[PDB]
Amino acid sequence: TCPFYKKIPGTGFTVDAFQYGVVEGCTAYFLTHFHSDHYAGLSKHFTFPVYCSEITGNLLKNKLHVQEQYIHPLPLDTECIVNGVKVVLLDANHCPGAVMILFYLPNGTVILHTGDFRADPSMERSLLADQKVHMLYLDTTYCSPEYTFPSQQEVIRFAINTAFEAVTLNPHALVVCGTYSIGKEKVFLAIADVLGSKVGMSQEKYKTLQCLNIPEINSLITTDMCSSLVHLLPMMQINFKGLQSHLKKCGGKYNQILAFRPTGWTHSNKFTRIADVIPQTKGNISIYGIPYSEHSSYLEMKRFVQWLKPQKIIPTVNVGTWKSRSTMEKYFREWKLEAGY
C-alpha cells in the first residue's frame, strides 16, 4: 500500500506515488522528476491530474504518451493554487526539470518535500528564506558521514582535461560516455565542447534530450554517429566487452576508446582525491569511474537542514530497514543539538 511518507497530511495530495493504482482520497498526484523509480506506473492510460515542471511535462507527453489534458505544468518560483491549496515549485539541483515542492496548508503548517536534490547554499536565497517550514520530507540517499564527494565543477574540470589530452595525443581515439536516465548531461556536453564535436547518440536518447529546454541544443547534439567523436551508449555497454564490440562498429575510424562511467558514490571516495583517479585498462580501451553526484553529500545535507531548522524530518530514502532508520534519526538529533533548534 502507499506508504505514509508519500502522503501530504491535510490535503488530498501524494508525491511520486504512481504505482499503487488509485490511492484512496487522492485528488492530485505530484511528480518531482522524470526518474523511473519516481514515475513508475505512469502511462497513456492515466486519468488523474499530474502536477510537475514544464520539462517533466514534455517527457510525460513525448516519452510516456500521457494525454495532454491530465498534465498540469507549473512555472518555478511562483505562488500557484492547486485544488484550493497554495504551492510553489523550486529547483532541486538534481536532473533536468527536478523540483522541490512547498505546500502551505490551510491550518498554517508549511511543508517542504525535497524530491531528489543536491543541497546547495543558493537554496538559502530562494523563496524558502521567506517563512518557517515545519515539516521536511528529505532526500536521505547519502545520510552518513562516509559520503564525501567533490563538487560537480571539480569533476567536470577533470573530465575535460583528461579527454582533451587523450584526443590531442591520439586523433584516432574515441570518447564514450554511459547513461541510463536523464541527469549528468554536463559530463558529455562539456567533453564534446572542448573537442569541437557534437555528441552522438541513438534516436531514443536524442528524443529524450530534445524535451529538456537546453539552450542551443540543436548546435550540441546529433544522431549521426560517424560525424561525432563523443558517443553516448547505454551504461550497460560501458565495459571492455561492450566497448570492443562497439569499436568494431565504427569500421577502423578509431583505434582507442576512452570511456567515462559517471557513478554516484564509490568506496575509493573515502581514500582518493579527484586529481589522483585512475582508469581500468585492457589493451586500447580505458574506463574512468568519475564521482559526479546529483544527490547531497552528508555535509551539504547537514548544512541545508541546520539552516532550515525544521520541527520534524520525514526521510524518503533508505527507509526500508530498521538499522538505516535508527542511524538516520541519530544524525538528525545530533544536528538539532549542535544547532540548538
Ligand code: NI
Ligand atoms: Ni532521481
